[PDB]
Amino acid sequence: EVETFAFQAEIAQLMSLIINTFYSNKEIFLRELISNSSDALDKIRYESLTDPSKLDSGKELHINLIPNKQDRTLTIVDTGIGMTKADLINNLGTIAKSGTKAFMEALQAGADISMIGQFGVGFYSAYLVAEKVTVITKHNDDEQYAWESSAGGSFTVRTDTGEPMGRGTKVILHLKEDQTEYLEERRIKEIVKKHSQFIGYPITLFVEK
Ligand SMILES: S=C(NCCc1ccccn1)N[C@@H]1C[C@@H]2CC[C@H]1C2
């Protein structure tokens, strides 16, 4: 059973801008998603200091990068705090409204797309390289859910029936046909070394066989 929602008007305009603007420095999408993963790992690690039982769903705090050339997908996995159903539908888009609005004003004040993380909406930079983004997430306080959008103004949320994650978030990027360079190992390594050398959690690049 699937539910379809409309994006916030501001969010929908940001995604249409991100998709339709000719912007060449697309590699910043990885820094933003890794930075989001780092924040999610910070939150569960902090909460576990006063409640060690929050880690019963998994003690490992790490980020995995998993390219897949046959499926043309790049997947970013973290074992952070994860997201509830309310996060996916209401709360996170509500926090992001002021940031989205401010980000689009700045885009005419001279600022460029690479400053998206300074407004707390770096996640949507995934649509620089992805035609479709699937998010699998599991919070200690909710069930496992699957969020998905190909932009166009709508997204879906459903209960996920697949392999249980335990805890964390899996961002699955269905890459555009001309963006397969981000499925290459030395390209991913160069981007991580350039943008995310100072992340306080292990970032493991899964090499294909
Ligand atoms: S509101 C949003 N990103 C911005 C919030 C944020 C800021 C800093 C770190 C982490 N998260 N993303 C939401 C999560 C699912 C994917 C799209 C929607 C549903």
Known binding residues for ATP are 36, 78, 97, 123
Q: How many CA atoms lie within 13 A of 151 on its CB side?
A: 23
Domains of the chain by range and CATH? 2-202 (3.30.565.10)
Query: Helices 9-20 & 92-106, crossing angle to 10 degrees?
Result: 50
- Experimental technique used to determine this entry: X-ray
Q: For the chain, how far is it from start to end, CA to CA, in angstroms? A: 35
How many A from CA of 45 to the centre of ligand 1? 19
- Phi/psi-derived region of residue 151, left when phi > 0, alpha when psi is between -120 and 50, beta in every other case: left
Q: How far apart are CA 57 and CA 48, in angstroms?
A: 11
Q: Looking at the CA of residue 121, tell me the nearest atom of ligand 1.
A: 4
Distance 83 CA to ligand 1 centre (A): 9
Work out the angle at residue 164's Cα, subtended by the Cα atoms of residues 40 and 124, and round it to the nearest 5 degrees.
40
For 23, residues 6+ apart whose C-beta sits below 8 A from its C-beta are 112, 113, 128
Give CA–CA dist 164/192, Å, rounded: 28
Closest C-alpha to ligand 1, atom 19: 88
Ligand 1 pocket, Cβ-based, cut-off 6 angstroms? 36, 39, 83, 88, 92-93, 96, 120-121, 123, 135, 147
Positions at the binding site: 36, 78, 97, 123
Number of neighbours of residue 58 by Cβ within 10 angstroms: 16
| Amino acid (one-letter) located at 115 | M
Cβ burial, residue 124 (10 Å; 0-12/13-18/19+): buried
| CA–CA gap between residue 88 and residue 131 (Å, rounded) | 19
What is the C-alpha to C-alpha distance for residues 35 and 208, in angstroms, rounded to an integer? 24
Report residue 24 CA to chain centroid gap: 20
